[PDB]
Design a protein around this ligand. Structure first.
Ligand SMILES: Nc1nc2c(ncn2CCC(CO)CO)c(=O)[nH]1
Ligand SMILES: Nc1nc2c(ncn2CCC(CO)CO)c(=O)[nH]1
Lengths: 308, 306
């Protein structure tokens, strides 16, 4: 059947993921861009400006953890909306994997992946204290089942160079919170190891008490963020409820094909560099033969209406 | 593999599910209300929070915005146990075994992910304390409907419900008769929605009427004619229209059965055992599935049931 190769470009904001993918796309391929219009208009109203202000009000000590928590938690629900719906309608047409030989019938490039809204950003906001780990796990329990051929390209960029970049300018409503850059960096690192650890066979349940290449110490995976007095019983173990969610986080990430593109270069180098990774990425067949078109018109509709 | 029979006793609160469900149990396990999770574990006394906020809104002390915001977060917390459960359970579910009995194990659940991912949220929306966009965020998050999904919804006339809803109701509640009118309307609609979807109805093909099956104005789609969802030219944006596509594939495959709650206990408890006859069973995926599945229902029970 016609194969389809999907690739999600994720990682912290401000590294140059949007450009590169354009350059990549500018060259069969459709682009599912960031739904700003949803965040700005359709879904709420300046969702991203809302996020940055609340956390700010929180840092000023004008809003209490709970007011920012309740405001943050709900601001996240809006962010992941477009990712979640796209997956939901996409899922059916996705069939069994085929194999990284050139080429596919279609290539869908994504700007971020469900996990970025249902995990990374929240966990990050949690370390930032504007969110709880209970809520964080709530999203984790909603992360959709991982689809075959789910290729995730996270991104590497030096700090000074990343800070430097954010410094110049980025999203409308965005405030330069270096600490946030730090958290969000941390979370995307962990995420990488987490996949690795998991793929190498880690089993957090065994390594709990301990709280490509070699297997990372569970203490270096995302789990570690979940060793908190909120999530622990009077006898120290995690409440089964959360443990069980860490068990889904594990299942979700366990089948992902994660890659690290380097962003410490020219937009073109990033394009060329990201292109040389797309070749070792696993693709899949479609479910209906006429899925390529609908999957196509689907991405073009998302773009035309949510892009900005 | 052995078969399993899962039943999700749903419907509006204040009718007697809880009351009638325990009775059957006292082969059959019972996964209760995660009350300890709503009160303690996930956050603090969530319910009193849901009700207060609605109150403050009603009593003009707070704004629809402020309500919506807190109202949204809370739901996240109310549905948590359902999701994780559904997600930890999922793989043990094999395909529909004919109807093939007697099942090696019967699981009775106290509500389905939809109560927290669709129903109540639809209800609070209808209350001014929650955005339709928000409601569709959870509708999309609705997990794929597993095979052998049987939902029991309850019938009890408004008056009797008012009476039972007032018998006593949860730590923190406040009798909100409107929230009773909102909630009854929702499940009622959902009842029609499942039949709509099974008699072959297409919401895209019917969507313009709002301006053998039930009329689309008598389904959960009619709620999403929320102007906020509509384009300047009245149209419905593709995001929501997709959310609705989801909502449809989700419900259509459900098996919903009606339990008349207007009849004293055991009388309802009886009817609950009678319905069990047409509910679909499933095989489990692995040898040790049933046992793992038993523990889940017992460990959720001791930890979250209060
Ligand atoms: N989901 C979510 N996304 C967040 C958060 N902060 C920044 N972003 C990404 C927003 C821009 C970068 O800041 C990129 O569009 C947050 O709390 N949640
Ligand atoms: N998910 C959700 N549930 C709500 C809300 N309001 C009342 N309930 C009722 C729950 C009842 C179960 O019978 C009382 O325990 C709400 O806003 N969201």
């Amino acid at each position: 059947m016609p194969t389809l190769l999907r690739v999600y470009i994720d990682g912290p904001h401000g590294m140059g993921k949007t450009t590169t993918t354009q350059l990549l796309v500018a060259l069969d391929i459709v682009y599912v861009p960031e739904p700003m219009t949803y965040w700005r208009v359709l879904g709420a109203s300046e969702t991203i400006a809302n996020i940055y202000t609340t956390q700010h009000r929180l840092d000023q000590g004008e809003i209490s953890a709970g007011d920012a928590a309740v405001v943050m938690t709900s601001a996240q629900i809006t962010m992941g909306m477009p990712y979640a719906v796209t997956d939901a309608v996409l899922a059916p047409h996705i069939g069994g994997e085929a194999g990284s030989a050139p080429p596919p019938a279609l290539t869908l490039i994504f700007d971020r992946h469900p996990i970025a809204a249902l995990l990374c950003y929240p966990a990050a906001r949690y370390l930032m204290g504007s969110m709880t780990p209970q809520a964080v796990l709530a999203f984790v329990a909603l992360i959709p089942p991982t689809l075959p051929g789910t290729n995730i390209v996270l991104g590497a960029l030096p700090e000074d160079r990343h800070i430097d970049r954010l410094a110049k300018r980025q999203r409308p409503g965005e405030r330069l919170d270096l600490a946030m850059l730090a958290a969000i960096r941390r979370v995307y690192g962990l995420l990488a190891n987490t996949v690795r650890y998991l793929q190498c066979g880690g089993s957090w349940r065994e390594d709990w008490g301990q709280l490509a290449g070699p297997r990372p110490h569970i203490g270096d995976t995302l789990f570690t963020l979940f060793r908190a007095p909120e999530l622990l019983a009077p006898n120290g173990d995690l409440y089964n409820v959360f443990a069980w969610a860490l068990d889904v986080l594990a299942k979700r990430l366990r089948s992902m094909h994660v890659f690290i593109l380097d962003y410490d270069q020219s937009p073109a180098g990033c394009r060329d560099a990201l292109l040389q990774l797309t070749s070792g990425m696993v693709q899949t067949h479609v479910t209906t033969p006429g899925s390529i078109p609908t999957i196509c018109d689907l991405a073009r509709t998302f773009a035309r209406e949510m892009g900005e």
